Amino acid sequence: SNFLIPNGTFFAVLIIFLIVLGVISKWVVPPISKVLAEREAMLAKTAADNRKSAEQVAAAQAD
Amino acid sequence: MSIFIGQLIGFAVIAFIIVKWVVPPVRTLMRNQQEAVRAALAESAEAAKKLADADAMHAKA
Amino acid sequence: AIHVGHHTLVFELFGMTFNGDTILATAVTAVIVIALAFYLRAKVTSTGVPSGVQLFWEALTIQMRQQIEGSIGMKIAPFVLPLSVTIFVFILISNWLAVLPLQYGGADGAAAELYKAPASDINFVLALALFVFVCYHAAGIWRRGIVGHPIKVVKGHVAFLAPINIVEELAKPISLALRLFGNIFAGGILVALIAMFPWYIQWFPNAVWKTFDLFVGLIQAFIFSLLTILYFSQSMEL
Amino acid sequence: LDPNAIITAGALIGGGLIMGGGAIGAGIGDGIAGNALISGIARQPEAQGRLFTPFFITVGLVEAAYFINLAFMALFVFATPGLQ
Amino acid sequence: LDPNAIITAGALIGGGLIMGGGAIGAGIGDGIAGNALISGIARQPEAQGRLFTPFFITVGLVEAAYFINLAFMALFVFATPGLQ
Amino acid sequence: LDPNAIITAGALIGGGLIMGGGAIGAGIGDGIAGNALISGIARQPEAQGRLFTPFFITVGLVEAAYFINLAFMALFVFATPGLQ
Amino acid sequence: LDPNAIITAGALIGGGLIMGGGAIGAGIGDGIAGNALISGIARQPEAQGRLFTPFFITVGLVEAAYFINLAFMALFVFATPGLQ
Amino acid sequence: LDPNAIITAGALIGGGLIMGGGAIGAGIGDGIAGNALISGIARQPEAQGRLFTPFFITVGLVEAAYFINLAFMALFVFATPGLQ
Amino acid sequence: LDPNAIITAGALIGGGLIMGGGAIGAGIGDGIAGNALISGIARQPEAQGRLFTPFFITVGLVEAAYFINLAFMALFVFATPGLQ
Amino acid sequence: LDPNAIITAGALIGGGLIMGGGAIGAGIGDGIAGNALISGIARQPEAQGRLFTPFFITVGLVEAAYFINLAFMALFVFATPGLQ
Amino acid sequence: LDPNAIITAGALIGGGLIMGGGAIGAGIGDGIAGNALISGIARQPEAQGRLFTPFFITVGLVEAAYFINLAFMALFVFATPGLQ
Amino acid sequence: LDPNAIITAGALIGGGLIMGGGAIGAGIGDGIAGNALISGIARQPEAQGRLFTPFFITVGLVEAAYFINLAFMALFVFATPGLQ
Query: I79 phi and psi, to 5 degrees?
Result: -120, 85
C-alpha span between C176 and D61 (Å, rounded): 10
Cβ–Cβ of I8/G13 closer than 8 Å?
no
Residues of L in contact with K33 (CB under 8 A): 31, 34-35, 38
| DSSP helix/strand/coil, C78 | coil
Contact C174, E69 (CB under 8 A): no
Structure-determination technique: cryo-EM
Q: Which residues, in sequence order, are CB contacts of C233 under 8 Å at separation 6+?
A: C68, C71, C72, C77
* Residue L60 CA to its chain's centroid (Å): 10
Contact I24, K22 (CB under 8 A): no
Cβ–Cβ of C223/D60 closer than 8 Å?
yes
Pairing, β C111-113 against β C16-18: unpaired
Q: What is the 3-state secondary structure (H, E, C) of chain J?
A: CCHHHHHHHHHHHHHHHHHHHHHHHHHHHHHHHHHHHHHHHHHCHHHHHHHHHHHHHHHHHHHHHHHHHHHHHHHHHCCCCCCC
C-alpha span between E17 and C103 (Å, rounded): 36
Helix axes F3-43, F48-78, angle to 10 degrees: 180
Question: Bridge partners of B38?
Answer: none
| Chains G and I touching, counted as 3 or more CB pairs less than 8 Å apart | yes
Q: Count Cβ atoms within 10 A of the Cβ of residue K56 and give its class: 0-12 exposed, 13-18 middle, 19 or more buried.
A: middle
Contact D58, E56 (CB under 8 A): no
A38 has a chain B CB within 8 A of its CB: no
| DSSP helix/strand/coil, C75 | coil
Cβ–Cβ of J23/L21 closer than 8 Å?
yes
Mutate to test the interface with A, among D72, D78, D80 (most CBs of A within 10 A): D78
C-alpha span between K37 and A10 (Å, rounded): 56
Cβ–Cβ of F60/C215 closer than 8 Å?
yes
Superfamily holding E3-79:
F1F0 ATP synthase subunit C (1.20.20.10)
Superfamily holding D3-78:
F1F0 ATP synthase subunit C (1.20.20.10)
List, as one string, the DSSP characters of L15-63: HHHHHHHHHHHHHHHHHHHHHHHHHHHHH-GGGHHHHHHHHHHHHHHHH
Contact C11, C18 (CB under 8 A): yes
CA-based diameter of chain I, in Å? 65
Please give the C-alpha separations between residue I13 and each of C141, I37, J14, L7, in angstroms, as whole numbers. Answer: 48, 36, 19, 19
Q: Which residues, in sequence order, are CB contacts of C171 under 8 Å at separation 6+?
A: E63, E64, E66, E67
Contact D38, F43 (CB under 8 A): no
Please give the C-alpha separations between residue L18 and each of H11, I72, J67, K27, L77, in angstroms, as whole numbers. Answer: 19, 20, 15, 19, 11
Question: Bridge partners of C16?
Answer: C13
Contact H10, F77 (CB under 8 A): no
Q: Which domain holds residue C125?
A: 11-235
C-alpha span between F14 and C152 (Å, rounded): 44
C-alpha span between L9 and K84 (Å, rounded): 12
Q: Which residues, in sequence order, are CB contacts of G65 under 8 Å at separation 6+?
A: G22, G25, G26, G29, I22, I23, I26, I27, I30, I63, I66
C-alpha span between J16 and F71 (Å, rounded): 26
No. of H helices and E strands in chain G? 2, 0
List, as one string, the DSSP characters of C197-234: S-HHHHHHHHHHHHHHHHHHHHHHHHHHHHHHHHHHHH
Query: Where are the domains positioned within chain K?
Result: 3-79
From the list C119, C137, C226, the residue with the least C-alpha distance to C177 is C119
C-alpha span between F58 and D27 (Å, rounded): 10
C-alpha span between F54 and E21 (Å, rounded): 29
| Chains D and A touching, counted as 3 or more CB pairs less than 8 Å apart | yes
C-alpha span between D59 and E58 (Å, rounded): 15
Contact C43, C27 (CB under 8 A): no
Q: Count Cβ atoms within 10 A of the Cβ of residue K17 and give its class: 0-12 exposed, 13-18 middle, 19 or more buried.
A: buried
Residue A16: inside a domain, yes or no? Answer: no
- Measured from the Cβ of residue F72, the count of other Cβ atoms closer than 10 Å reads 27
Contact H77, J82 (CB under 8 A): yes
Q: Using alpha carbons only, give the angle C97, C101, C105 rounded to the nearest 5 degrees.
A: 120
From the list C53, C78, F22, the residue with the least C-alpha distance to A25 is C78
Among all residues of chain C, which has the CA nearest to that of B7? C203
From the list D40, E39, H37, the residue with the least C-alpha distance to F38 is H37
How many domains does the structure of chain C reveal?
1
Provide the b/e sequence for C174-202 (b: ≥16 CB within 10 Å): bbbbbbbbbbbbbbbbbbbbbbbbebeeb
Q: Using alpha carbons only, give the angle F12, J63, D34 rounded to the nearest 5 degrees.
A: 75
Among all residues of chain I, which has the CA nearest to that of G58? I34
Q: Which subunits sit against K, judged by 3+ Cβ pairs under 8 A?
A: I, L
| DSSP helix/strand/coil, A63 | coil
Which amino acid is residue G64, in one-letter code?
A
Q: Smallest CA–CA separation between H41 and chain J, in Å? A: 7
Query: C76 phi and psi, to 5 degrees?
Result: -100, -50
Q: Which subunits sit against F, judged by 3+ Cβ pairs under 8 A?
A: C, D, H
Q: Using alpha carbons only, give the angle D67, D68, D69 rounded to the nearest 5 degrees.
A: 85
From the list G17, G57, G18, G15, the residue with the least C-alpha distance to G36 is G57
Residues of A in contact with C122 (CB under 8 A): 3-7
Which amino acid is residue J30, in one-letter code?
D
Q: Count Cβ atoms within 10 A of the Cβ of residue L17 and give its class: 0-12 exposed, 13-18 middle, 19 or more buried.
A: buried
- Measured from the Cβ of residue B49, the count of other Cβ atoms closer than 10 Å reads 12
| DSSP helix/strand/coil, K5 | helix
| DSSP helix/strand/coil, B46 | helix
Q: Count Cβ atoms within 10 A of the Cβ of residue J64 and give its class: 0-12 exposed, 13-18 middle, 19 or more buried.
A: middle
- Measured from the Cβ of residue C162, the count of other Cβ atoms closer than 10 Å reads 11
- How many residues make up chain F in this entry? 84
Question: Bridge partners of F21?
Answer: none
J82: left (phi over 0), alpha (psi -120 to 50) or beta: left
Pairing, β C103-105 against β C111-113: antiparallel
Contact J50, H41 (CB under 8 A): yes
Contact K39, I43 (CB under 8 A): no
Cβ–Cβ of A1/D71 closer than 8 Å?
no
Please give the C-alpha separations between residue L5 and each of H6, H30, J39, K78, in angstroms, as whole numbers. Answer: 17, 40, 50, 17
C-alpha span between I67 and I30 (Å, rounded): 13
Cβ–Cβ of C105/B13 closer than 8 Å?
no
From the list E68, A5, F13, the residue with the least C-alpha distance to G20 is E68
C-alpha span between C193 and K63 (Å, rounded): 48
Pairing, β C103-105 against β C11-13: unpaired
Q: Which runs of consecutive H residues, i.e. helices, occur in C49-161?
A: 52-71, 80-97, 122-144, 148-155
Among all residues of chain A, which has the CA nearest to that of C37? A28
Distance from the first to the final alpha carbon of chain G: 13
Q: Count Cβ atoms within 10 A of the Cβ of residue D42 and give its class: 0-12 exposed, 13-18 middle, 19 or more buried.
A: buried
Contact C181, C92 (CB under 8 A): no
Contact K20, K70 (CB under 8 A): no
CA-based diameter of chain F, in Å? 67
List, as one string, the DSSP characters of chain D: --HHHHHHHHHHHHHHHHHHHHHHHHHHHHHHHHHHHHHHHHH-GGGHHHHHHHHHHHHHHHHHHHHHHHHHHHHHHTS-TT--
Contact E63, C175 (CB under 8 A): yes
Contact D37, F37 (CB under 8 A): no
C-alpha span between J36 and H35 (Å, rounded): 5
Q: Report DSSP state, residue I79.
A: S
Q: Report DSSP state, residue C157.
A: S
C145: left (phi over 0), alpha (psi -120 to 50) or beta: left
From the list I26, K42, E4, D65, the residue with the least C-alpha distance to G64 is I26
Question: Bridge partners of C11?
Answer: C18
Q: Which residues, in sequence order, are CB contacts of C80 under 8 Å at separation 6+?
A: C68, C72, C139, C228, C229, C232
Query: Where are the domains positioned within chain B?
Result: 19-61
Cβ–Cβ of C160/G52 closer than 8 Å?
no
Q: Report DSSP state, residue E81.
A: T
Query: C8 phi and psi, to 5 degrees?
Result: -100, 155
CA-based diameter of chain J, in Å? 66
Q: Smallest CA–CA separation between D38 and chain A, in Å? A: 33
Q: Which helix (H) or strand (E) holds C103?
A: strand C103-105
| Chains K and H touching, counted as 3 or more CB pairs less than 8 Å apart | no
Instruction: Report the residue from G40, G69, G80 with minimal CB separation from I23.
Output: G69
C-alpha span between F78 and F71 (Å, rounded): 11
Cβ–Cβ of E28/G28 closer than 8 Å?
yes
Q: Smallest CA–CA separation between A11 and chain D, in Å? A: 22
Residues of C in contact with G52 (CB under 8 A): 158
Cβ–Cβ of J34/L59 closer than 8 Å?
yes
Please give the C-alpha separations between residue K60 and each of J83, K24, K67, in angstroms, as whole numbers. Answer: 44, 16, 10
C-alpha span between K40 and K51 (Å, rounded): 7
Cβ–Cβ of B50/A39 closer than 8 Å?
no
Which amino acid is residue A24, in one-letter code?
I
Q: Which subunits sit against E, judged by 3+ Cβ pairs under 8 A?
A: C, D, G
Q: Which subunits sit against G, judged by 3+ Cβ pairs under 8 A?
A: C, E, I
Side-chain half-sphere CA neighbours of H36 within 13 A: 29
Q: Which residues, in sequence order, are CB contacts of B20 under 8 Å at separation 6+?
A: none
C-alpha span between I82 and K32 (Å, rounded): 37
Contact L55, L37 (CB under 8 A): yes
Helix axes C162-194, C122-144, angle to 10 degrees: 150
Q: Which residues, in sequence order, are CB contacts of H34 under 8 Å at separation 6+?
A: J29, J32, J33, J36, J54, J55, J57, J58, J59, J61, J62
Residues of A with CB under 8 A from a CB of D: 1-4
Q: Report DSSP state, residue K82.
A: T
C-alpha Rg value of chain H to the nearest Å: 19
Q: Report DSSP state, residue F2.
A: -
Contact J11, H13 (CB under 8 A): no
Which amino acid is residue B14, in one-letter code?
I
Q: Which runs of consecutive H residues, i.e. helices, occur in E1-84?
A: 3-43, 48-78
Cβ–Cβ of D75/A2 closer than 8 Å?
yes
Cβ–Cβ of D50/E41 closer than 8 Å?
yes
C-alpha span between C155 and C237 (Å, rounded): 13
Cα torsion angle, J68, J70, J75, J76, sign: positive
Cβ–Cβ of A42/B40 closer than 8 Å?
yes
| DSSP helix/strand/coil, F81 | coil
